[PDB]
Amino acid sequence: NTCAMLTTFNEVDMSNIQEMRARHKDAFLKKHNLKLGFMSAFVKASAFALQEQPVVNAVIDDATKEVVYRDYIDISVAVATPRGLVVPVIRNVETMNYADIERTINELGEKARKNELAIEDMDGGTFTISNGGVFGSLFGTPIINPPQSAILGMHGIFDRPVAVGGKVEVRPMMYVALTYDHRLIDGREAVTFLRKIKAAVEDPRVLLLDL
Amino acid sequence: QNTCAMLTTFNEVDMSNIQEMRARHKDAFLKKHNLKLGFMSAFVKASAFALQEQPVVNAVIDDATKEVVYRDYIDISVAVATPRGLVVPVIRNVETMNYADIERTINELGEKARKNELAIEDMDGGTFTISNGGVFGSLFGTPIINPPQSAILGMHGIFDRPVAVGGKVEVRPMMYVALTYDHRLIDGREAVTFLRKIKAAVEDPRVLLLDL
Amino acid sequence: KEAQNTCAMLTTFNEVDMSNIQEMRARHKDAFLKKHNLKLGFMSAFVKASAFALQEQPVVNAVIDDATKEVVYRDYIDISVAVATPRGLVVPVIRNVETMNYADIERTINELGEKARKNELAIEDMDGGTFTISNGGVFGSLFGTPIINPPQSAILGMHGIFDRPVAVGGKVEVRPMMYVALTYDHRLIDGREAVTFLRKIKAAVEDPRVLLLDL
Amino acid sequence: LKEAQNTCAMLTTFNEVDMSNIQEMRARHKDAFLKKHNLKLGFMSAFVKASAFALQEQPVVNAVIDDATKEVVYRDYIDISVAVATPRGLVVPVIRNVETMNYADIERTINELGEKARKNELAIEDMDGGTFTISNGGVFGSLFGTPIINPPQSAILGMHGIFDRPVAVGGKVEVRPMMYVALTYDHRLIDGREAVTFLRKIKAAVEDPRVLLLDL
Amino acid sequence: LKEAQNTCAMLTTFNEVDMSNIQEMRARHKDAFLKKHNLKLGFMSAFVKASAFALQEQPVVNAVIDDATKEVVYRDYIDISVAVATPRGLVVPVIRNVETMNYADIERTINELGEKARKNELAIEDMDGGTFTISNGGVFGSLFGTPIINPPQSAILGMHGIFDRPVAVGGKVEVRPMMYVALTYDHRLIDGREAVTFLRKIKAAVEDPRVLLLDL
């Protein structure tokens, strides 16, 4: 009786991020000592789209029926543990490039694995990401954890035949999801947000171009 | 999903035949009716046909008396998106209508919406809600039932995907369609058949004339 | 609805290649009729896959007790398969599913269908299920979200088998694929458990040899 | 300018940058860039941002010989002084705080500064304070040549025309739009290694702009 | 630097060198060279020996304009100042009487000088006094550029990176490992024709080392 949940889906062509991870895999590891991953691209695209559409960043206060707009943006990434899935928080992401996002993700994942994370940074955040792609999933409905207003559900990357230029081609594709609440965000805004994340991931130069 | 009854179903409709009709007859349509040809009329007519062939979907549960009302008239509330927002203008008596009339009424209601002469009378009483979120590129998604009716058809963007025909791979322009229905009056079989029948009517518009 | 509010149901989807199942049906239909006097189908494979996955994963089989707030555990698996009758839909439950194979599942399904058709199906053969499989693919559906029948904790949504082009080994071929959906009670089952459960079901259906190999 | 060509002891280094990705990105995003940002995508934003990247990773070049005290001051800010072409002549407007700008922000600054200069509104504050120069003589069809260090700065990047030239990729021969770029540096502060690495970083940033996001 | 730029009016002439012969000889002789000399073959020794040969044939470049007397001094000995990589920074050790050794001894001299500079035991005895400096930029992948004359020499060689480039050999295009070579010379002593001939002799002696043996 609190939240009514609805979901929209879309698909992202991960054929450019794979190339980046395939060419700058040793230089990045030599200069920073971390493994390149898909998660930084999606975090940065989420930050870009949240900046473009601040209504997705806002949240309704059910106690006073007030809409609070938050200028800071934080994606609450998720890492799985044997005792249960735990959701850390990446803080102040609108001014981090791929290196900083990757390093924060690595540190938070290590802390979750060795169990030294307390509630001080587990609470808060304006966005969530539920990367269910570690365990191969085609697509699905992700739950909104409280008190957020939307969550991105990333699933596994699979090779399926897609039609580009009228010809059947095999490219690595990912199904993305966006569980929002109609009480705050309309369907058009959620569709535009997901499509903008898709655009910013499938061509990272959009971030440099501000498109 | 708690206070929605939710429980949606999805299908794929091929739009090769509909775009062929548009490419063939859009000039004549503009010359005669002074309008433009889209895929909206196909979906509205298909929904009307599907509602004719099984009216239990068109029914509404009255929780006040535990009574199901089987309304005979078909009233489809086509949603037109405007920068101010999405509204629900209602097209009356879709059973006695064709593609030209449906397009004309859709355009007229949209024009009333642009200048905001949308009276309360032409904003309710609909038996079925058709929401087009496909004007914004989206693969598929789950829409929401509009009260008091118990179903809604939401179409999405048209993309070209490879699909098998006769065992051979061929690229055709396809759509994803969705239907969220209240399980308290219509079971899964009925709603799946309803969506299949809408898809069959849109894919081959001549089944409307053949009355299948 | 009170049941809707109390249960927070979430859905996840996957796809199954129905290439091995159809081949085994093609090669093992006449022998099935000669031996068991009964025709082969699709439901037995999915029922057995769900049974094997539940045996490996007891959490999905378990249900929370609403009366006392206890996650009561069940050492026994009973799938509740929905059969179709002219007078409507009924959900008979097949009992002691761990200790039978494809042949006995077909026998039980046939007996329950012929009992429902002729209207001698009592209340003992109706309740007591632990997991449900909804075969919504008979009426040609692509995919969708099923609903859990109480007091069960999860449902597997079987859909129609469609000839669809999919790339395996870098080549595009046409294979008969089916979309599977798992609507699960999130209060008890987590995302990892649900995804792994659906993957185990899909793997067992794609290769029936996994069941006897006990992976 | 004569009192710099010998006192600064300039040496010139040259490299080729492959403008395939830049042209690809322009062809792909020009329509949307004009529709949303109300400008036109260009070559110079990429080069200015690449220079900012290289001056971030290599701060000795960003420094200047302070002849008063023989000091090498490591600035925490980068001041790119682009040569904007005007019908009257060539001027040197400056872009300030180039560490944090996207391609669109640099485009907007360059277009606004060019409109200011063409309509004769350029102020001194928009002309002084340079730290690195991106003088572009390539719209004149030049192949390659040696630029001159702009005082008080310690280096300058000279850009020239873009021509389709045969190159080797994986042992095969393919024609692609190839570009000759030059760097004229003060060898008293910058070793050969430092200047060559500077040009390699600029070339890598221009060839694959994804490096800027990837922070490699 | 300041003095070299201000006093000498150094001019630079350029050329391109095939390295396919050197690459082939390395590919076929690396294993034997390592097994016998316990050293790994390099591209540098061929260039040093070719420069020594060209200095032998043209003794004008093997000479210095004496500043005090405005005269020329002809050195019968050839010394080359090869720059050796080092994390501290590149230095300039000197090889003595380069014309008397082949590739094998130049390789061992370079290896010993690199080992000694790595441990920073580079004495000034074997550090200053050369006659012709050679600078390598191929380890940082520079395309081409003008090197600075190390004083008090009269010229310098400007070896750069080696890149596969499409070139014309007998009317058809094939990709061969090609490298730009540059010579910065004091035009006061060495004339234009002498500088071009010197660079051409270095080119000839590097393109096929059999000229060195053949004494062409």
PDB file of N, CA, C and O in Angstrom, chain A residues 71-113:
ATOM      1  N   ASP A  71      20.516  17.619  -5.331  1.00  0.00           N
ATOM      2  CA  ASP A  71      21.508  18.013  -6.323  1.00  0.00           C
ATOM      3  C   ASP A  71      22.705  17.074  -6.366  1.00  0.00           C
ATOM      4  O   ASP A  71      23.290  16.887  -7.437  1.00  0.00           O
ATOM      5  N   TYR A  72      23.087  16.486  -5.236  1.00  0.00           N
ATOM      6  CA  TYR A  72      24.112  15.457  -5.251  1.00  0.00           C
ATOM      7  C   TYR A  72      23.544  14.183  -5.868  1.00  0.00           C
ATOM      8  O   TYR A  72      22.344  13.908  -5.784  1.00  0.00           O
ATOM      9  N   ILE A  73      24.413  13.407  -6.510  1.00  0.00           N
ATOM     10  CA  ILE A  73      24.004  12.146  -7.120  1.00  0.00           C
ATOM     11  C   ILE A  73      24.960  11.050  -6.664  1.00  0.00           C
ATOM     12  O   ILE A  73      26.182  11.246  -6.656  1.00  0.00           O
ATOM     13  N   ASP A  74      24.400   9.922  -6.228  1.00  0.00           N
ATOM     14  CA  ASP A  74      25.156   8.777  -5.732  1.00  0.00           C
ATOM     15  C   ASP A  74      24.464   7.501  -6.185  1.00  0.00           C
ATOM     16  O   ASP A  74      23.297   7.277  -5.850  1.00  0.00           O
ATOM     17  N   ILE A  75      25.174   6.664  -6.933  1.00  0.00           N
ATOM     18  CA  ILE A  75      24.673   5.346  -7.308  1.00  0.00           C
ATOM     19  C   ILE A  75      25.053   4.350  -6.224  1.00  0.00           C
ATOM     20  O   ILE A  75      26.221   4.261  -5.833  1.00  0.00           O
ATOM     21  N   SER A  76      24.055   3.614  -5.730  1.00  0.00           N
ATOM     22  CA  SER A  76      24.252   2.599  -4.697  1.00  0.00           C
ATOM     23  C   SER A  76      24.448   1.248  -5.380  1.00  0.00           C
ATOM     24  O   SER A  76      23.519   0.455  -5.542  1.00  0.00           O
ATOM     25  N   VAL A  77      25.689   0.984  -5.788  1.00  0.00           N
ATOM     26  CA  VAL A  77      25.986  -0.256  -6.493  1.00  0.00           C
ATOM     27  C   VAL A  77      25.777  -1.442  -5.561  1.00  0.00           C
ATOM     28  O   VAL A  77      25.656  -1.291  -4.339  1.00  0.00           O
ATOM     29  N   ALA A  78      25.718  -2.638  -6.141  1.00  0.00           N
ATOM     30  CA  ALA A  78      25.417  -3.854  -5.399  1.00  0.00           C
ATOM     31  C   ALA A  78      26.527  -4.873  -5.605  1.00  0.00           C
ATOM     32  O   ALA A  78      27.073  -4.988  -6.707  1.00  0.00           O
ATOM     33  N   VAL A  79      26.860  -5.602  -4.544  1.00  0.00           N
ATOM     34  CA  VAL A  79      27.824  -6.694  -4.595  1.00  0.00           C
ATOM     35  C   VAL A  79      27.251  -7.869  -3.813  1.00  0.00           C
ATOM     36  O   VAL A  79      26.710  -7.685  -2.717  1.00  0.00           O
ATOM     37  N   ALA A  80      27.349  -9.066  -4.384  1.00  0.00           N
ATOM     38  CA  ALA A  80      26.789 -10.252  -3.756  1.00  0.00           C
ATOM     39  C   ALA A  80      27.776 -10.873  -2.775  1.00  0.00           C
ATOM     40  O   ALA A  80      28.990 -10.880  -2.998  1.00  0.00           O
ATOM     41  N   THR A  81      27.238 -11.395  -1.681  1.00  0.00           N
ATOM     42  CA  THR A  81      27.998 -12.076  -0.645  1.00  0.00           C
ATOM     43  C   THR A  81      27.313 -13.395  -0.328  1.00  0.00           C
ATOM     44  O   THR A  81      26.105 -13.540  -0.545  1.00  0.00           O
ATOM     45  N   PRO A  82      28.060 -14.381   0.177  1.00  0.00           N
ATOM     46  CA  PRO A  82      27.427 -15.658   0.547  1.00  0.00           C
ATOM     47  C   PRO A  82      26.334 -15.519   1.592  1.00  0.00           C
ATOM     48  O   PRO A  82      25.383 -16.311   1.587  1.00  0.00           O
ATOM     49  N   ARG A  83      26.434 -14.540   2.489  1.00  0.00           N
ATOM     50  CA  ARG A  83      25.437 -14.356   3.535  1.00  0.00           C
ATOM     51  C   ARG A  83      24.241 -13.536   3.074  1.00  0.00           C
ATOM     52  O   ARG A  83      23.303 -13.342   3.855  1.00  0.00           O
ATOM     53  N   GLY A  84      24.249 -13.055   1.837  1.00  0.00           N
ATOM     54  CA  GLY A  84      23.183 -12.213   1.322  1.00  0.00           C
ATOM     55  C   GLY A  84      23.756 -11.046   0.545  1.00  0.00           C
ATOM     56  O   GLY A  84      24.885 -10.605   0.775  1.00  0.00           O
ATOM     57  N   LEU A  85      22.968 -10.539  -0.400  1.00  0.00           N
ATOM     58  CA  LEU A  85      23.411  -9.424  -1.222  1.00  0.00           C
ATOM     59  C   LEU A  85      23.390  -8.128  -0.421  1.00  0.00           C
ATOM     60  O   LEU A  85      22.424  -7.830   0.286  1.00  0.00           O
ATOM     61  N   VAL A  86      24.467  -7.353  -0.537  1.00  0.00           N
ATOM     62  CA  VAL A  86      24.608  -6.087   0.170  1.00  0.00           C
ATOM     63  C   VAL A  86      24.833  -4.991  -0.862  1.00  0.00           C
ATOM     64  O   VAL A  86      25.445  -5.217  -1.910  1.00  0.00           O
ATOM     65  N   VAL A  87      24.326  -3.801  -0.568  1.00  0.00           N
ATOM     66  CA  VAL A  87      24.361  -2.677  -1.490  1.00  0.00           C
ATOM     67  C   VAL A  87      25.229  -1.582  -0.877  1.00  0.00           C
ATOM     68  O   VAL A  87      24.817  -0.897   0.060  1.00  0.00           O
ATOM     69  N   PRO A  88      26.468  -1.434  -1.341  1.00  0.00           N
ATOM     70  CA  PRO A  88      27.266  -0.258  -0.974  1.00  0.00           C
ATOM     71  C   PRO A  88      26.728   0.997  -1.646  1.00  0.00           C
ATOM     72  O   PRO A  88      25.693   0.987  -2.313  1.00  0.00           O
ATOM     73  N   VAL A  89      27.443   2.102  -1.452  1.00  0.00           N
ATOM     74  CA  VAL A  89      27.084   3.379  -2.058  1.00  0.00           C
ATOM     75  C   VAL A  89      28.338   4.025  -2.627  1.00  0.00           C
ATOM     76  O   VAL A  89      29.317   4.236  -1.902  1.00  0.00           O
ATOM     77  N   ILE A  90      28.305   4.345  -3.917  1.00  0.00           N
ATOM     78  CA  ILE A  90      29.324   5.179  -4.541  1.00  0.00           C
ATOM     79  C   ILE A  90      28.871   6.621  -4.386  1.00  0.00           C
ATOM     80  O   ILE A  90      27.759   6.976  -4.790  1.00  0.00           O
ATOM     81  N   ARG A  91      29.724   7.457  -3.805  1.00  0.00           N
ATOM     82  CA  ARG A  91      29.327   8.798  -3.409  1.00  0.00           C
ATOM     83  C   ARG A  91      29.946   9.841  -4.326  1.00  0.00           C
ATOM     84  O   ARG A  91      31.136   9.773  -4.647  1.00  0.00           O
ATOM     85  N   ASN A  92      29.123  10.802  -4.749  1.00  0.00           N
ATOM     86  CA  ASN A  92      29.564  11.978  -5.498  1.00  0.00           C
ATOM     87  C   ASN A  92      30.268  11.572  -6.797  1.00  0.00           C
ATOM     88  O   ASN A  92      31.473  11.742  -6.974  1.00  0.00           O
ATOM     89  N   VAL A  93      29.464  11.021  -7.711  1.00  0.00           N
ATOM     90  CA  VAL A  93      29.989  10.406  -8.929  1.00  0.00           C
ATOM     91  C   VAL A  93      29.990  11.341 -10.132  1.00  0.00           C
ATOM     92  O   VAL A  93      30.626  11.028 -11.150  1.00  0.00           O
ATOM     93  N   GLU A  94      29.317  12.488 -10.051  1.00  0.00           N
ATOM     94  CA  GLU A  94      29.210  13.360 -11.215  1.00  0.00           C
ATOM     95  C   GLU A  94      30.537  13.985 -11.618  1.00  0.00           C
ATOM     96  O   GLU A  94      30.593  14.662 -12.648  1.00  0.00           O
ATOM     97  N   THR A  95      31.599  13.794 -10.835  1.00  0.00           N
ATOM     98  CA  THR A  95      32.897  14.372 -11.153  1.00  0.00           C
ATOM     99  C   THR A  95      33.998  13.316 -11.167  1.00  0.00           C
ATOM    100  O   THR A  95      35.171  13.636 -10.968  1.00  0.00           O
ATOM    101  N   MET A  96      33.644  12.058 -11.408  1.00  0.00           N
ATOM    102  CA  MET A  96      34.612  10.975 -11.498  1.00  0.00           C
ATOM    103  C   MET A  96      34.596  10.409 -12.910  1.00  0.00           C
ATOM    104  O   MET A  96      33.524  10.230 -13.496  1.00  0.00           O
ATOM    105  N   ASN A  97      35.778  10.144 -13.453  1.00  0.00           N
ATOM    106  CA  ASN A  97      35.905   9.439 -14.721  1.00  0.00           C
ATOM    107  C   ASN A  97      35.882   7.934 -14.456  1.00  0.00           C
ATOM    108  O   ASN A  97      35.525   7.477 -13.367  1.00  0.00           O
ATOM    109  N   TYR A  98      36.263   7.141 -15.458  1.00  0.00           N
ATOM    110  CA  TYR A  98      36.174   5.690 -15.328  1.00  0.00           C
ATOM    111  C   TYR A  98      37.140   5.159 -14.276  1.00  0.00           C
ATOM    112  O   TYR A  98      36.823   4.197 -13.566  1.00  0.00           O
ATOM    113  N   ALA A  99      38.323   5.765 -14.164  1.00  0.00           N
ATOM    114  CA  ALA A  99      39.313   5.277 -13.208  1.00  0.00           C
ATOM    115  C   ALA A  99      38.808   5.387 -11.775  1.00  0.00           C
ATOM    116  O   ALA A  99      38.916   4.432 -10.994  1.00  0.00           O
ATOM    117  N   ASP A 100      38.251   6.542 -11.412  1.00  0.00           N
ATOM    118  CA  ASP A 100      37.775   6.741 -10.047  1.00  0.00           C
ATOM    119  C   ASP A 100      36.598   5.828  -9.728  1.00  0.00           C
ATOM    120  O   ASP A 100      36.523   5.261  -8.630  1.00  0.00           O
ATOM    121  N   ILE A 101      35.666   5.681 -10.670  1.00  0.00           N
ATOM    122  CA  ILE A 101      34.530   4.789 -10.455  1.00  0.00           C
ATOM    123  C   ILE A 101      35.015   3.360 -10.250  1.00  0.00           C
ATOM    124  O   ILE A 101      34.572   2.661  -9.330  1.00  0.00           O
ATOM    125  N   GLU A 102      35.950   2.913 -11.092  1.00  0.00           N
ATOM    126  CA  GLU A 102      36.464   1.556 -10.962  1.00  0.00           C
ATOM    127  C   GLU A 102      37.164   1.354  -9.626  1.00  0.00           C
ATOM    128  O   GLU A 102      36.997   0.310  -8.982  1.00  0.00           O
ATOM    129  N   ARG A 103      37.945   2.341  -9.180  1.00  0.00           N
ATOM    130  CA  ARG A 103      38.676   2.161  -7.929  1.00  0.00           C
ATOM    131  C   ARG A 103      37.736   2.161  -6.728  1.00  0.00           C
ATOM    132  O   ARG A 103      37.911   1.359  -5.801  1.00  0.00           O
ATOM    133  N   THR A 104      36.721   3.030  -6.731  1.00  0.00           N
ATOM    134  CA  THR A 104      35.754   3.014  -5.641  1.00  0.00           C
ATOM    135  C   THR A 104      34.990   1.697  -5.614  1.00  0.00           C
ATOM    136  O   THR A 104      34.752   1.128  -4.540  1.00  0.00           O
ATOM    137  N   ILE A 105      34.613   1.188  -6.790  1.00  0.00           N
ATOM    138  CA  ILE A 105      33.923  -0.095  -6.857  1.00  0.00           C
ATOM    139  C   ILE A 105      34.802  -1.207  -6.303  1.00  0.00           C
ATOM    140  O   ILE A 105      34.336  -2.056  -5.535  1.00  0.00           O
ATOM    141  N   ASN A 106      36.086  -1.218  -6.671  1.00  0.00           N
ATOM    142  CA  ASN A 106      36.984  -2.261  -6.185  1.00  0.00           C
ATOM    143  C   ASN A 106      37.131  -2.202  -4.669  1.00  0.00           C
ATOM    144  O   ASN A 106      37.062  -3.232  -3.984  1.00  0.00           O
ATOM    145  N   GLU A 107      37.335  -0.999  -4.125  1.00  0.00           N
ATOM    146  CA  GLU A 107      37.494  -0.868  -2.680  1.00  0.00           C
ATOM    147  C   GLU A 107      36.241  -1.320  -1.943  1.00  0.00           C
ATOM    148  O   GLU A 107      36.323  -2.063  -0.954  1.00  0.00           O
ATOM    149  N   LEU A 108      35.070  -0.886  -2.411  1.00  0.00           N
ATOM    150  CA  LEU A 108      33.836  -1.242  -1.727  1.00  0.00           C
ATOM    151  C   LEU A 108      33.559  -2.736  -1.834  1.00  0.00           C
ATOM    152  O   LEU A 108      33.084  -3.355  -0.875  1.00  0.00           O
ATOM    153  N   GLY A 109      33.865  -3.337  -2.985  1.00  0.00           N
ATOM    154  CA  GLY A 109      33.703  -4.774  -3.119  1.00  0.00           C
ATOM    155  C   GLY A 109      34.612  -5.552  -2.190  1.00  0.00           C
ATOM    156  O   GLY A 109      34.189  -6.538  -1.579  1.00  0.00           O
ATOM    157  N   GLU A 110      35.871  -5.125  -2.067  1.00  0.00           N
ATOM    158  CA  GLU A 110      36.781  -5.807  -1.152  1.00  0.00           C
ATOM    159  C   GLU A 110      36.311  -5.671   0.292  1.00  0.00           C
ATOM    160  O   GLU A 110      36.358  -6.640   1.063  1.00  0.00           O
ATOM    161  N   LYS A 111      35.850  -4.477   0.674  1.00  0.00           N
ATOM    162  CA  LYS A 111      35.350  -4.286   2.032  1.00  0.00           C
ATOM    163  C   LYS A 111      34.115  -5.134   2.302  1.00  0.00           C
ATOM    164  O   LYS A 111      33.966  -5.678   3.402  1.00  0.00           O
ATOM    165  N   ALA A 112      33.218  -5.257   1.322  1.00  0.00           N
ATOM    166  CA  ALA A 112      32.057  -6.122   1.498  1.00  0.00           C
ATOM    167  C   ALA A 112      32.468  -7.585   1.613  1.00  0.00           C
ATOM    168  O   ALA A 112      31.905  -8.331   2.421  1.00  0.00           O
ATOM    169  N   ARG A 113      33.443  -8.014   0.806  1.00  0.00           N
ATOM    170  CA  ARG A 113      33.879  -9.406   0.860  1.00  0.00           C
ATOM    171  C   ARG A 113      34.538  -9.742   2.191  1.00  0.00           C
ATOM    172  O   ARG A 113      34.317 -10.834   2.728  1.00  0.00           O
TER     173      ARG A 113
END
